[PDB]
From a paper:
The XBB.1.5 variant of SARS-CoV-2 has rapidly achieved global dominance and exhibits a high growth advantage over previous variants. Preliminary reports suggest that the success of XBB.1.5 stems from mutations within its spike glycoprotein, causing immune evasion and enhanced receptor binding. In late 2022, a recombination occurred between Omicron sub-lineages BA.2.75 and BA.2.10.1 resulting in a new variant XBB.1 and its further sub-lineage XBB.1.5, the latter of which rapidly became the most dominantly sequenced lineage in the United States. We find that while the XBB.1.5 maintains a high binding affinity for human ACE2 as similar to previous variants, it has a diminished affinity for mouse ACE2, representing a departure from earlier SARS-CoV-2 variants.
We first characterised the overall architecture of the XBB.1.5 spike protein via cryogenic-electron microscopy (cryo-EM). We obtained a global reconstruction of the XBB.1.5 spike ectodomain at 2.8 Å resolution, finding 2 down RBDs and 1 unresolved RBD. The architecture of the XBB.1.5 spike protein is similar to previous variants such as the Alpha, Beta, Gamma, Delta, and Omicron lineages. The resolution of the RBD and NTD regions of the XBB.1.5 spike protein is much lower than that of the S2 core, highlighting the flexibility of these regions, as seen with previous variants. Tamura et al. recently reported the cryo-EM structure of the closely related XBB.1 spike protein, resolving two different closed states (all RBDs down). The major difference between these two closed states is slight differential positioning of the RBDs in the down state, suggesting RBD flexibility as observed in the unresolved RBD within the XBB.1.5 spike structure presented in Fig. 1C, D.
Residue numbers in the entry:
A (entry chain A): 14 to 23, 27 to 71, 78 to 143, 153 to 178, 187 to 249, 256 to 301
B (entry chain A): 746 to 827
C (entry chain B): 746 to 795
D (entry chain A), E (entry chain B): 944 to 1042
F (entry chain C): 302 to 620, 641 to 675, 691 to 696
G (entry chain A): 549 to 620, 641 to 675, 691 to 696
H (entry chain B): 848 to 893
The structure:
Amino acid sequence: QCVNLITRTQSYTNSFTRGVYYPDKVFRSSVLHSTQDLFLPFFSNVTWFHAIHVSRFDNPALPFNDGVYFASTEKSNIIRGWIFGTTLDSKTQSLLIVNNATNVVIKVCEFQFCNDPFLDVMESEFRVYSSANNCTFEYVSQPFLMDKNLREFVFKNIDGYFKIYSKHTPINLERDLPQGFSALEPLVDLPIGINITRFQTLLALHRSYLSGWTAGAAAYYVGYLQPRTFLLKYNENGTITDAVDCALDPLSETKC
Amino acid sequence: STECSNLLLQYGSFCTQLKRALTGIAVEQDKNTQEVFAQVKQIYKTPPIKYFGGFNFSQILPDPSKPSKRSPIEDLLFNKVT
Amino acid sequence: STECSNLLLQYGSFCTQLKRALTGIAVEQDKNTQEVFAQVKQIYKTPPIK
Amino acid sequence: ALGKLQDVVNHNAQALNTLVKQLSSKFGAISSVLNDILSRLDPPEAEVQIDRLITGRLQSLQTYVTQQLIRAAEIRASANLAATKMSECVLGQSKRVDF
Amino acid sequence: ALGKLQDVVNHNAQALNTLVKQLSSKFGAISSVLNDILSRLDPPEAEVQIDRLITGRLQSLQTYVTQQLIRAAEIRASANLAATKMSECVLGQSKRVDF
Amino acid sequence: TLKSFTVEKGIYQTSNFRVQPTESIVRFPNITNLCPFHEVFNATTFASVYAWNRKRISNCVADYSVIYNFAPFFAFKCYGVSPTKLNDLCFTNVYADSFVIRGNEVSQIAPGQTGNIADYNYKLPDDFTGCVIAWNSNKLDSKPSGNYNYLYRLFRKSKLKPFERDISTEIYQAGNKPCNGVAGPNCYSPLQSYGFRPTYGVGHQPYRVVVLSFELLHAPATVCGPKKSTNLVKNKCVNFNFNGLTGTGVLTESNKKFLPFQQFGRDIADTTDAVRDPQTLEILDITPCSFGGVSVITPGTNTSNQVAVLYQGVNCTEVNVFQTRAGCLIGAEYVNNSYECDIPIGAGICASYQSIIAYT
Amino acid sequence: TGVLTESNKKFLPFQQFGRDIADTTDAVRDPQTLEILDITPCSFGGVSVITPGTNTSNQVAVLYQGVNCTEVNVFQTRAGCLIGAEYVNNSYECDIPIGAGICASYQSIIAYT
Amino acid sequence: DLICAQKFNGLTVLPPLLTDEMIAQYTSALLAGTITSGWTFGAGPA
Ligand SMILES: *[C@@H]1O[C@H](CO)[C@@H](O[C@@H]2O[C@H](CO)[C@@H](O)[C@H](O)[C@H]2NC(C)=O)[C@H](O)[C@H]1NC(C)=O
Ligand SMILES: *[C@@H]1O[C@H](CO)[C@@H](O[C@@H]2O[C@H](CO)[C@@H](O)[C@H](O)[C@H]2NC(C)=O)[C@H](O)[C@H]1NC(C)=O
Ligand SMILES: *[C@@H]1O[C@H](CO)[C@@H](O)[C@H](O)[C@H]1NC(C)=O
Ligand SMILES: *[C@@H]1O[C@H](CO)[C@@H](O)[C@H](O)[C@H]1NC(C)=O
Ligand SMILES: *[C@@H]1O[C@H](CO)[C@@H](O)[C@H](O)[C@H]1NC(C)=O
Ligand SMILES: *[C@@H]1O[C@H](CO)[C@@H](O)[C@H](O)[C@H]1NC(C)=O
Ligand SMILES: *[C@@H]1O[C@H](CO)[C@@H](O)[C@H](O)[C@H]1NC(C)=O
Ligand SMILES: *[C@@H]1O[C@H](CO)[C@@H](O)[C@H](O)[C@H]1NC(C)=O
Ligand SMILES: *[C@@H]1O[C@H](CO)[C@@H](O)[C@H](O)[C@H]1NC(C)=O
């Protein structure tokens, strides 16, 4: 039942200082810690995607590179998860993350994905994939898309583990990528061990009951992580409140 | 670690040398302070009436009000070095 | 050699210590010159009829 | 104004911090923690790893003592100058220009 | 006549020259060239050979910095003496005998 | 310390006082599941080296003693860890990699090895920790006419990455001429089978290799040894073992708001300030036990044999007792009367012999 | 790794490589064509950052020590190439020392004798 | 070639802050003060 319904336009914006995450699970308080990891560089070029369904294939699959920073200002029900893999068909393993109102299901199988995958609402995954065989991983836990509210995620695929980091922010009357620091916290480490070179976002579409699906829009920001050295400021309570990118400009290099 | 100390013993009197050098520096610092400040063997005191022909030495003489018995300049110096 | 630098990083802040010490010596030499020669703040000149 | 004295305090604390920071250096060994090396390896190879750690830490400590000795010499020269100023400027009137 | 200044220049150049000569020392490794070790040896043994070269070169550099610190202290003492002569012999008339 | 039978008047640094730990506490996760090592090591069939089988081991307590108890493992070589200490450690990232190779290729299953299967079939990282197990499988993985079920990748364009498997059965171009997916001159299939026969001697017989891979302490651990958890004690100097982390210190309550993912707590110098326990998810602040330097204040042995001891930087309640800023002085009586300094103690306090007195 | 410039050194026929006083290669003979080349390693420099306080401003200037300006508001000093500071013919007291008589100050960042 | 060999291995000679001309100018100023004003210039106005 694979149908092409989503068209996508793209613009370019500035990352500012978004995308910082806790690099490990060690509590550090009132210190300056310099770490080298895959970070989103400061003031980097981030692609803003607008996905519109009105009631041809115009929603291509994005590359993964070394890790992905994801952001969205949309509500928790429109964007419902992601797709990760290389070929996105039945010949290689792939990772499907689907969130709903009650929990999150993370599942790695040999999905035969549709070209324009979307969850249609009960909820059906027949428009996400046509088949799923030789399934090797499943993990169900509390959801990380819950309820204006900016939702930030960091996905990494390092040495067998898919690390997911998340943060939510009460943004207001400001450009969707706000100033200031909101460090993302480690949410889950998954022992996946698969090859990921491409990824795609999953949206939810409602049946029309009157142009089979209700018209909708979703806006999300995608940036790419790079091997960078950061100097993070840990405050009194252990929160990363500030950072300098060591290789951004000579002033920050001096600070580093 | 006991095993580390046992392996450390193979290197000889390096630890004794470092302790002796640091001890020499430590006694040297006290000697430096004695040489600079302990140059009088009488603790002289100023007369109770601080009149010296118009010259005012309040900023350099000890302050009775302060518990530390320091001068205003000395108090400022102690505050400004941390 | 990148491999050598990666191995060198295991030794800690030896490189930082050496750079700091040499930088201290370098500023010290300029300070020495200022102490010896820059003892007047007016550049005096001799009369034309010497 | 009080940059010289603060500088001395700054050097000493920084030296101690560096000396403490050098404990987190592997020095070409598997780990910087001795307890992990003991808890993980047999004495024939743990001896090698502990030897690498001992030589690195001992070199760090000798370096610290050497710079302490050089700074002690510099501070001793400054103290001798201060004693000379106390004797000649405070305990008498000096005819030495700019002293 | 001008041996003292020439000695200072000579010592500095000699120290730099010795430090460059230290690069051509194997230090107990197969070769003094890192490129040769990388090209001829697999990483397990390459790490050991580069470790030997790193420790030897680092020791040489530490030795050079220590010598520079001692010489800097000596030159600082000479410069302090020169400043004292500039203040007391040039900017005034000195009653100190032989100063 | 002074290597002499006569000691002159003065203060001498002799040793370091340190309070010793009173008991050892081991804290391990309560969860106990028998670990499935039988499945990996006793399997009838193993995979080929190009398509080596990887099994994840997690959320189990592993008894490695039975691996030793029954063992046809001709080669049992560990790289980053001792074999007998495996029962005393906690691990995560445990993986068993099973494959079949030649007798002579067992040297190539090592970090940094040069080979055909090393480059194009199975690559180990340089920083690999774990154990390689190799055993002869002539009885099971050989046939008299030739057991050709085990294949290796003879040809590939580039070397593989660590822990990467390549199963693509595409042709390789070995010469200048392109092959276009069809075999012929200088165009060969990459996967070739081993000619395993029982008649050959050792060195060519099929060998089953299992690689156990671990990670050391850089994540919360889920695989632990059979060691039993002990109770927790507060405010006492103890030698504790939290998930394979051994330390000596006093465990106290903490007021540091740790985040849920956070376990370890680190101070400015990366010293472990606090720790969290798997069995009970609570934060124990770790403080090193009381210690200090001991200085022996003594007059000459010519004069007297009485000594006083100064514990430097140690309050008197943690060891003629006098508390000074320098430390706790035992053996000297404080005298209000002021005299000149005879033996310097510190912070304005000096000691003399008249008994040994201490004064300002 | 290095630049291969033309060499004026006349090698004897049996010699292949060339060495410095400090036993570092300074010359080489090409195997294909019997010509002499002066191997000179690629330019390196000590990047120094000249900045006022962050309390005052975030503008910075970069000094490449020992590097000619053609090999990297660009000014050439004997210390190296200074980028980000404008040379002013006025003379002031030294605020940030650059070297060879050049000092820098913030008023933008200016460099002066 | 000594200087080039030292430079190639990462050893650099930083230039002195005061040039020879400025040090010569300082000595000239001291000479002019000591010749025209005696020791007065070192203790206050020349
Ligand atoms: C939200 O997702 C959860 C998990 O996929 C759904 O709960 C499952 O429902 C199926 C019915 O098809 C049951 O067989 C499973 O046992 C349930 N699992 C759990 C963990 O509850 C839930 O139905 C979904 N809700 C909506 C509205 O889509
Ligand atoms: C000496 O100097 C001190 C301080 O310089 C003078 O004390 C000041 O007295 C005036 C008037 O009594 C007050 O308004 C100031 O607040 C005082 N200053 C301080 C720092 O306390 C003092 O009057 C001077 N004369 C004598 C004779 O002591
Ligand atoms: C972001 O990238 C696009 C094309 O990739 C480019 O045209 C645009 O200039 C970039 N943005 C910035 C701020 O450089
Ligand atoms: C994958 O599925 C196909 C068909 O369902 C099957 O032939 C193949 O053996 C499966 N592989 C695994 C590893 O399960
Ligand atoms: C991951 O998949 C891509 C796409 O097929 C492939 O080109 C790449 O080599 C794979 N990576 C590894 C490490 O096998
Ligand atoms: C840190 O925690 C304390 C105690 O809960 C709280 O009062 C304070 O606002 C928090 N934030 C900062 C920045 O101190
Ligand atoms: C191993 O497998 C053999 C059959 O090949 C069986 O007889 C034996 O009981 C098994 N042992 C274990 C410990 O599973
Ligand atoms: C066992 O450990 C888990 C965490 O791994 C904890 O949630 C549970 O409470 C523990 N069981 C008991 C009986 O304390
Ligand atoms: C080698 O070949 C080159 C190129 O053909 C030629 O110029 C040269 O004369 C030949 N002989 C020698 C000895 O280099």
